[PDB]
Amino acid sequence: LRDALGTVADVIRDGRAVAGGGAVEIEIAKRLRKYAPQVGGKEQLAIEAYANAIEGLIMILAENAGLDPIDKLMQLRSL
Amino acid sequence: LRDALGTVADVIRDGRAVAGGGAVEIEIAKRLRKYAPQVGGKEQLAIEAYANAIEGLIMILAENAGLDPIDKLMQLRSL
Ligand SMILES: Nc1ncnc2c1ncn2[C@@H]1O[C@H](COP(=O)(O)OP(=O)(O)O)[C@@H](O)[C@H]1O
Numbered sequence: 001l002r003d004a005l006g007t008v009a010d011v012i013r014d015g016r017a018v019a020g021g022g023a024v025e026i027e028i029a030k031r032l033r034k035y036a037p038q039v040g041g042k043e044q045l046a047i048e049a050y051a052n053a054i055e056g057l058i059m060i061l062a063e064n065a066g067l068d069p070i071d072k073l074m075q076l077r078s079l
Numbered sequence: 080l081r082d083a084l085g086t087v088a089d090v091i092r093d094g095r096a097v098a099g100g101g102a103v104e105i106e107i108a109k110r111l112r113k114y115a116p117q118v119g120g121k122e123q124l125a126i127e128a129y130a131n132a133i134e135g136l137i138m139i140l141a142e143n144a145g146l147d148p149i150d151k152l153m154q155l156r157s158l
């Protein structure tokens with residue numbers, strides 16, 4: 001209850017809100033793979049890696065729901 | 080000389096010709112990364128790998144010319 005109250009208060013003081021289904025994370029992955037070709041130096045291999053690694057989060061979250069993760073990941077990204 | 084003659088004959092009987100600077104290979108890599116999202120199944124991870132592996136050829140060829148390969152690869156792909 002005190003944790004829930006604090007959670008709500010942090011919403012109140014943000015005034016804004018986001019989804020949580022890992023979908024915030026996947027959308028970040030889609031902005032990143034469009035920013036990285038503008039930088040183009042050796043640094044590019046680092047940003048492409050970062051996007052792939054944060055896409056690596058929901059791949060774990062699905063595995064705790066017992067789904068076969070790779071197949072659900074590709075289906076999700078396709079949608 | 081007999082190898083050169085045979086090389087020419089294979090051109091004559093093709094009637095068509097291509098560059099050789101590894102650039103044929105890099106252009107294939109650019110078609111592939113545009114075909115793969117249409118397939119979309121788990122098979123996608125295999126085609127993206129294939130494109131990355133054939134892009135892995137000229138990375139070796141530059142190393143036999145002593146250049147630092149990664150930097151020349153990124154510069155080439157950017158061009
Ligand atoms: N019921 C749920 N359905 C889907 N995603 C959830 C659910 N509960 C939590 N999440 C997601 O799990 C992550 C939060 O992990 P969690 O262990 O709950 O953190 P905390 O322990 O700090 O609450 C976020 O991606 C959140 O949106």
Ligand SMILES: Nc1ncnc2c1ncn2[C@@H]1O[C@H](COP(=O)(O)OP(=O)(O)O)[C@@H](O)[C@H]1O
Pocket residue numbers: 098099100101
């Ligand atoms: N002088 C060169 N400059 C650039 N690329 C070259 C040159 N000579 C060969 N290549 C490339 O090297 C590859 C051919 O490798 P090579 O060892 O010559 O095969 P082979 O021994 O059968 O002739 C192709 O990509 C070809 O275009």
